[PDB]
Amino acid sequence: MTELCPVYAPFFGAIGCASAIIFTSLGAAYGTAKSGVGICATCVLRPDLLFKNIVPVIMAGIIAIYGLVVSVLVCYSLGQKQALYTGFIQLGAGLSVGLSGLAAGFAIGIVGDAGVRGSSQQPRLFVGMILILIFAEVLGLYGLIVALLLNSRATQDVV
Amino acid sequence: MSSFYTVVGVFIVVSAMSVLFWIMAPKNNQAVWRSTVILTLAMMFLMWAITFLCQLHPLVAPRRSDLRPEF
């Protein structure tokens, strides 16, 4: 165990690989669950909209995709003798993608539920929901991006 | 051997052809033709020039530790 590379440095990166998927899958599950509740409430009256009110459940899954990407990138930078700086960077990259995806999912759900419930009455609202949902989704993206940037430094110029 | 003057010359050519099209834009849907073609030329050129200028005098060089020595 080096000064710069303690034995516990891999702890943070492995918790970051986990945090990215666990929290982007919490947000995606919340979004999918609420959007599905809305879809089941609406499609009882309007089944024809079902294969088009699935969009929020598709966006929530994309949050989970953003943390399966940050997790897989952070897991391949994990090493037995990888620096504590790299471990902190990998923890930060998973904290960022995972938390941003949680927020984005929690919002995608609440907004998809509202928009599917209202679109069964006002079809023109579908465009409004998808636009409010693309801005809830971009939050998660912004986390991934930060996470990605973090990983671009995690292993580089590191002794 | 290319510099910012390459971007300037490409700009001159693009502006010349844009003016040429404006003069020779079809009468039918003339506004659509002029706007679409000239704006497309302008933004294509701008993106190309941005991509070319970043590579003119880059402050960071490609660095990798994975190439096979045979290359």
């Binding site: 579908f126 | 506004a31 706007s35 704006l39 933004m43 991509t51 060089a61 990798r64």
Partner: protein
């Protein structure tokens, strides 16, 4: 009875809905009780006006009755309706822009500029020749079979996709162009041109090698930094600056559209007190930032022996610490920055 009704129900419905529709329209007219004429005020395109008259004349020729002037153009200060003559190409973008709102009468239409700028800003956000080509083929499937798809019935999502078929075609074409400039085809890069980077003559397996600039890639991002450790650092810098420059250019174009609107409506006060001040405020800060970005790109700092100034730290100090420049981008940078800050604050 129901089969007898069904064979003619649609015709009866269409005929009665039209009669109810003509009687609602006449309901908007002022029936002059003393006379026996309805006064109906209607907005019609001026170019269509002649046609209107002709058709009305035809009606008279059909009826055979002699009536006084049935058309009288009127000059009233009433907000006329906004009408944009579109086609199968511009209809999609016009709908895109109209969803936000209806343009003011004779105001600069945002669909004409969106025809190109909405696909190209998407392409910047997309930038892949593979995905761009797939989308181009998807749009071509609708475009080439546009007649057949128009004849048939379409679902809401499919109807939206088909209406914006030319939108998607342009998005795919510009995505192909941008991905070529990004050198990104299905996440891979093309090696059409000689790279501007030369890797060391010899190295051992696993040895960190850095390339030397021997030239500039003609079109697009050099494929030399594909799969390289620092590739992301160059891509991020380039694309941040590209986005900033493109957005500033697209906002300046829109602001000059506002100027054109002011000129057309003869609102000189808007030009003096609304357009010029905001233009100076936006230029002096963010157009100055864009010019600094381009100039820093155009300057060989390593060869010149001068540090590469941080444009973000330059902009931050342009406000928080005026007159304090860590690295001089150009001569008299401090004075120019102070002058621009004063211009914005005025």
């Amino acid at each position: 009875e129901l089969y007898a009704i069904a064979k003619e129900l649609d015709s009866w419905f269409q005929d009665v809905t039209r009669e109810k529709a003509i009687f609602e329209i006449l309901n908007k007219s002022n029936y002059d009780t003393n006379r026996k004429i309805l006064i109906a005020e209607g907005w019609i395109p001026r170019d269509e006006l002649a046609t209107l008259q002709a058709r009305l004349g035809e009606m008279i020729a059909r009826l055979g009755i002699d009536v006084p002037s049935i058309i009288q153009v009127l000059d009233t200060n009433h907000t006329p309706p906004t009408f944009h003559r579109t086609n199968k190409f511009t209809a999609g973008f016009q709908s895109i822009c109209d969803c936000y709102g209806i343009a003011q009468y004779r105001e600069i239409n945002a669909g004409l500029p969106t025809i190109v700028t909405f696909p190209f800003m998407f392409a910047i956000m997309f930038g892949d020749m593979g995905h761009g080509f797939l989308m181009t083929l998807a749009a071509l499937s609708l475009v080439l079979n546009e007649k057949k798809i128009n004849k048939m019935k379409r679902g809401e999502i499919f109807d939206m996709a088909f209406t914006g078929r030319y939108i998607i075609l342009l998005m795919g074409v510009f995505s192909m162009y941008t991905g070529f400039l990004y050198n990104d085809i299905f996440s891979k890069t093309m090696t059409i041109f000689k790279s501007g980077w030369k890797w060391p003559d010899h190295w051992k397996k696993g040895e960190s090698i850095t390339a030397t600039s021997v030239g500039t890639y003609p079109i697009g991002l050099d494929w030399a930094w594909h799969g390289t450790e620092n590739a992301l650092l160059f891509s991020n810098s380039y694309k941040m600056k590209l986005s900033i420059l493109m957005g500033f250019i697209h906002m300046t174009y829109s602001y000059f559209f506002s100027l054109a609107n002011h000129l057309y409506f003869n609102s000189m006060i808007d030009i003096i007190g609304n357009f010029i001040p905001g233009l100076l405020f936006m230029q002096g800060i963010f157009g100055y930032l864009s010019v600094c970005i381009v100039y820093k790109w155009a300057v060989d700092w390593v060869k010149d022996g001068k540090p590469a100034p941080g444009l973000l730290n330059m902009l931050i100090n342009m406000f928080l610490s005026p007159g304090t420049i860590d690295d001089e981008l150009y001569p008299h940078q401090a004075k120019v920055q102070v002058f621009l800050l004063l211009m914005a604050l005025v």
